[PDB]
Design a protein around this ligand. Structure first.
Ligand SMILES: O=C(Nc1c[nH]nc1-c1nc2cc(CN3CCOCC3)ccc2[nH]1)NC1CC1
Length: 272
């Protein structure tokens, strides 16, 4: 990881929170190409000091994204570990995370938009699967909208997958249960069951989000009822726009070895 000096970073407005993290828009002063000086808009992700003990995992989550280069994976610029701070410096995405975008724009998002976004996310996940690299936290909150759809120029939206954050293999059990139904049942049973098939299940949950205008599946159930939801082997209800419902349920298969490869997922999306 490239080291960035605290003096080169300016913190601006809070953009949100993650698990034990706070997110800010910022500016990085840097020497760029041809030696030209730039002030670049950056994403500053700060691990809470009270949870400094997660630092390794916090940074490892980003390292996974930095080992491979792909048009659908967020760019990591570096880290700032000056003083008592653990700061991840990433690219700033203009339109924010996909969950909020779906909630705010669900009245003007049609099936073609959801299909294109789904194809792009499946392409990112197929890239990861080919490299046998587990993400571990696929969800709408970890998808960023680089570009909006422009039907005037026939231009589709463009998304990137962001880093998973602190791994579910070290997170407290109550948080994992709160993350049902993104965390697959085998990982609720044993978080060390984290595998490539995890990402297929969570991909299904994320498709449900994309089809549900920003709603959170099972949000009305508390942790105990989410657990029992897995115990009784329920599936999510079909979204009102149910064009992808069968794909969602096929990905959210309680048998991990039966979850389809992302190549088959992509073939299914292209058939629709
Ligand atoms: O990783 C995240 N966000 C980002 C990573 N890279 N860039 C971002 C990001 N970029 C963001 C930009 C906005 C500004 N809004 C955008 C949509 O239109 C209204 C204003 C808000 C939040 C944003 N988050 N998680 C989101 C904060 C909870």
């Amino acid at each position: 990881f490239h080291k960035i000096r605290n003096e080169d970073l300016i913190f601006n407005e809070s953009l949100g929170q993650g698990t034990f993290t706070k997110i800010f828009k910022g500016v990085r002063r840097e020497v760029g190409d041809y030696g030209q000086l730039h002030e670049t808009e950056v994403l500053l992700k700060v691990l809470d000091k009270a949870h400094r003990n997660y630092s390794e995992s916090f940074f490892e989550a980003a390292s996974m994204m930095s080992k491979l280069s792909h048009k659908h994976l967020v760019l990591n610029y570096g880290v700032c570990v000056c003083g008592d701070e653990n700061i991840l410096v990433q690219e700033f995405v203009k339109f924010g995370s996909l969950d909020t975008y779906l909630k705010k724009n669900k009245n003007c998002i049609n099936i073609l938009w959801k299909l294109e976004v789904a194809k792009q996310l499946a392409a990112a996940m197929h890239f990861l699967e080919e490299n046998t690299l587990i993400h571990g936290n696929v969800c709408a909150k970890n998808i960023l909208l680089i570009r909006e759809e422009d039907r005037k120029t026939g231009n589709p939206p463009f998304i990137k997958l962001s880093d998973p954050g602190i791994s579910i293999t070290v997170l407290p059990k109550d948080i994992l249960q709160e993350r049902i139904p993104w965390v697959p049942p085998e990982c609720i049973e044993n978080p060390k069951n984290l595998n490539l098939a995890t990402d297929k299940w969570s991909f299904g949950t994320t498709l449900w989000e994309i089809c549900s205008g920003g709603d959170k599946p099972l949000s009305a159930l508390d942790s105990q009822r989410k657990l029992q939801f897995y115990e009784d082997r329920h599936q999510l209800p079909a979204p009102k726009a149910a064009e992808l419902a069968n794909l969602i349920n096929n990905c959210m298969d309680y048998e991990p070895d039966h979850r389809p490869s992302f190549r088959a997922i992509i073939r299914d999306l292209n058939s629709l």
